[PDB]
């Protein structure tokens, strides 16, 4: 692919997301989604091979079905109230269809199956984009229509997402599928607090995006897509594996690391309403994500796996391309808890 | 090769007394070893142990044991002089307490 064409496609993806974020008209929001998908399909196919083509096809089918349901919900809402402005969604059937369409776009359970497959079928850069930038538009719409949400449906989907993310991640040796299941669980956490406080949703999204960016950038720096290939990195660059171990611990939600901050905050918010059983269940379930993060840390940093002879040659060369934002991303992923009250600036 | 992998053999353990018959067991470098021994002994026994015990032994009476004993002595003297009971079953004056009006 031409670099000019790649830049144009990335800019079109971002423009579709921005159009979703700045629009007041439902038609313009739908157009933003369409433009984002149209530009996103070729980016997933940048390195051409059958797996990338399969991932792109599955992604297109899922997102096109979601957009059809989105448009039908908009039209039903218009039928029962001649309104185009994104507001309290005057019809409940239309609101149910809207919620299901947005959940399918986000990959929330039980519309979760496509996320591990698409993530595994594409490159690490495409996976970074898909798991970070592609969450902004549906979450922005959900934040805008939160007051009309049905808490039962969204809470059911969020709890299912957390459970399924943990259970599915428990079974993986491929790093991209691990990241996808982690994303599913974190989306569940984000949507669990949405009917109560959208500021907490934004805070969780920001912290998750920072940690995911650090994770994907560390995985690109050490060209590993499997557990066994990541188990070699200690014999080439131990600093990368140590930073990865601390980042995994933060993603597990352990204090005093930054990944503990959202869950903590969310739990507190849920106890400001009554909502006692659900946060307890959510934390006990997030223990599963912590377990498979810890297994990855065992494989890559806390023990030393056997290496190969040809690795000696790799000792003689340095990394050519350097990521300028990786150190700041790591620091923000780990040492940010003491600045928790700054979340007031989010609302 | 009838082998599984290329590995170093497990090495024998080093005796610190071989190269240093008076070795103190702190370091293989004799001078660093001797000074580690010296600093451990000086700052562990001479400074923290003895001086800390002396400091704790002479800590001033912030627990107010002697003050309480003297106050009790004055109270007992006064109460025995005036024939009052040494202690009262009530520690709060009933005139400052308002019981509920009705018990039925």
């Amino acid at each position: 692919m031409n670099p000019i064409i790649y830049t144009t496609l990335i800019m079109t993806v971002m423009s579709g997301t921005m159009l979703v974020m700045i629009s007041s008209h439902w038609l313009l929001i739908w157009i933003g989604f369409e433009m984002n998908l149209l530009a996103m399909i070729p980016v997933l196919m940048k390195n051409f091979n059958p797996r990338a083509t399969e991932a792109a096809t599955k992604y297109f089918l899922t997102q096109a079905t979601a957009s059809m349901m989105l448009m039908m919900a908009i039209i039903i809402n218009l039928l029962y109230s001649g309104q185009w402005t994104i507001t309290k969604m005057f019809n409940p059937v239309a609101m149910t269809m809207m919620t299901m369409a947005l959940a399918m776009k986000l990959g929330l359970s039980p519309f979760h199956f496509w996320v591990p497959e698409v993530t595994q079928g594409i490159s690490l850069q495409a996976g970074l984009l898909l798991l970070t930038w592609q969450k902004l538009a549906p979450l922005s719409v959900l934040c805008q229509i939160s007051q009309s949400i049905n808490p039962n449906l969204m809470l059911t989907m969020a709890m299912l997402s957390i459970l399924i993310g943990g259970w599915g991640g428990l079974n993986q040796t491929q790093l991209r599928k691990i990241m996808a299941y982690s994303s599913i669980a974190h989306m569940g956490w984000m949507t669990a607090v949405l009917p109560y406080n959208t500021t907490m949703t934004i805070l969780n999204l920001l912290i998750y995006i920072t940690m995911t960016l650090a994770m994907f950038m560390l995985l690109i720096h050490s060209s590993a897509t499997t557990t066994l290939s990541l188990s070699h990195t200690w014999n080439k660059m131990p600093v990368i594996t140590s930073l990865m171990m601390v980042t995994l611990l933060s993603m597990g939600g352990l204090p005093p690391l930054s990944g503990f901050m959202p869950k903590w905050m969310i739990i507190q918010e849920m106890t400001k309403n009554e909502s006692i059983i659900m946060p307890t269940l959510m934390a006990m379930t997030a223990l599963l994500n912590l377990y498979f993060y810890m297994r990855l840390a065992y494989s890559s940093s806390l023990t030393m796996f056997p290496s190969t002879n040809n690795m000696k040659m790799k000792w003689q060369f340095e990394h050519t391309k350097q990521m300028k934002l990786l150190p700041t991303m790591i620091v923000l992923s780990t040492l940010v808890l003491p600045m928790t009250p700054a979340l007031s600036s989010l609302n | 090769p009838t082998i599984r992998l290329q590995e170093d053999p497990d090495p024998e353990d080093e005796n610190l007394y071989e190269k240093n018959p008076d070795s103190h067991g702190y370091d293989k470098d004799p001078i660093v070893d001797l000074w580690n021994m010296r600093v451990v002994f000086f700052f562990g026994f001479s400074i923290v142990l003895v001086l800390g015990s002396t400091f704790v032994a002479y800590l001033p009476d912030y627990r107010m044991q002697e003050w309480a004993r003297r106050e009790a002595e004055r109270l007992v003297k006064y109460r025995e002089a005036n024939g009052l009971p040494l202690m009262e079953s009530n520690c709060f004056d009933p005139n400052k307490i308002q019981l509920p009006e009705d018990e039925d």
């Binding site: 692919m1 031409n2 670099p3 000019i4 790649y6 060209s223 499997t226 066994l228 290939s229 188990s231 070699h232 014999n235 023990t303 030393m304 796996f305 056997p306 290496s307 190969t308 002879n309 040809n310 690795m311 000696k312 040659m313 790799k314 000792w315 003689q316 060369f317 340095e318 990394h319 050519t320 391309k321 | 090769p1 009838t2 082998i3 599984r4 992998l5 290329q6 590995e7 170093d8």
Partner: protein, 320 residues
């Protein structure tokens, strides 16, 4: 400025620097044949850059200072003990073969990077496309196992497919008895133990796999022993080749851009040489790996990045 998407966007294009004499050349041949002299003569006459055959310490000559390192920290294999004890139960044979393939891949990447950066041609002795013959001669003699051949084929499959095969393949044919006579006249006590079956296996692999499969990508110039000393005739035979059949004419600016991004970044070149396949011949335990890596990091110019080693005379570090 480092070559990248920005350089390609404005200005830099590879297709313009090709001036009809790019012509990646390789000069293959059996053991002790005079292919190196012929390659040097070809490079001198045509004005191309000559690459001597990649040995155990080829990577050493391109990083740090060009001096070779200790065999323990680089290679971890011996050609002399391969000749002495080819059936050693310590895995020396396939370890040497795998390290040599990695070295050849690095040299091919260097040559391609030079050609794509300057437009000047290159002349190589052997390549990644020709290394396999030795592996075959190793397997037919029982020197390595079948699992080693499977691992070698996997690595070659995932590595050699990303580059362009050479424009013209030059072969020097020498009979096995003549090779034995040359080896005896040489005097190296390690090469006198080469049995004729090994050389015959190398020749069979060449003439039955390499030349037939290379002739489909481009025409192959074969020369006997006597008609290789006359290098000017070989050069003027090269100068009249109609090279319009292989993948090289099917290259445009974007494919060249991708290839140029690949040939630099030697880590990406060597990515798949260390795949987690645990053959006992090439697998190294954690304790030995840690000890050897600690030993390597203590070399005088290796602890930090090239410009940041003040123990080899790097100044102004605290502003770099």
């Amino acid at each position: 400025l480092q070559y990248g998407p920005l350089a390609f966007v404005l200005g830099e294009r590879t297709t313009r620097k090709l001036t009809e004499t790019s012509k990646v050349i390789t000069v293959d041949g059996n053991i002790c044949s005079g292919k190196g002299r012929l390659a040097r003569e070809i490079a001198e006459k045509l004005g191309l850059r000559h690459f001597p055959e990649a040995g155990i310490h080829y990577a050493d000559s391109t990083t740090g200072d060009g001096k070779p390192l200790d065999v323990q920290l680089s290679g971890n294999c011996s050609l002399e003990k391969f000749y002495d004890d080819p059936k050693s139960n310590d895995g020396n044979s396939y370890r040497l073969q795998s390290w040599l393939y990695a070295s050849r891949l690095l040299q091919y990447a260097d040559a391609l990077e030079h050609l794509l950066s300057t437009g000047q041609g290159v002349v190589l002795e052997r390549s990644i496309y020709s290394d396999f013959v030795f592996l075959e001669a190793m397997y037919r003699q029982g020197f390595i196992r079948k699992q080693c051949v499977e691992h070698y084929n996997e690595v070659k499959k995932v590595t050699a497919c990303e580059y362009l095969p050479p424009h013209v393949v030059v072969y020097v044919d020498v009979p096995v008895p003549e090779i034995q006579s040359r080896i005896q006249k040489k005097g190296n006590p390690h090469e006198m133990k080469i049995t004729a079956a090994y050389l015959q296996d190398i020749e069979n692999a060449y003439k039955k796999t390499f030349l037939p499969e290379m002739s489909e990508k481009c025409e192959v110039l074969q020369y006997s022993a006597r008609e290789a000393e006359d290098a000017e005739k070989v050069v003027e035979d090269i100068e009249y080749l109609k090279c319009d059949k292989g993948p090289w004419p099917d290259q445009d600016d974007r494919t060249f851009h991708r290839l140029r991004m690949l040939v630099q970044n030697k880590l990406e070149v060597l990515n798949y040489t260390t795949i987690p396949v645990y053959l006992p011949e090439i697998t190294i335990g954690a304790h030995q790996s840690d000890r050897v890596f600690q030993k390597f990091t203590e070399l005088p110019g290796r602890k930090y990045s090239p410009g940041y080693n003040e123990d080899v005379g790097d100044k102004w570090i605290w502003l770099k």
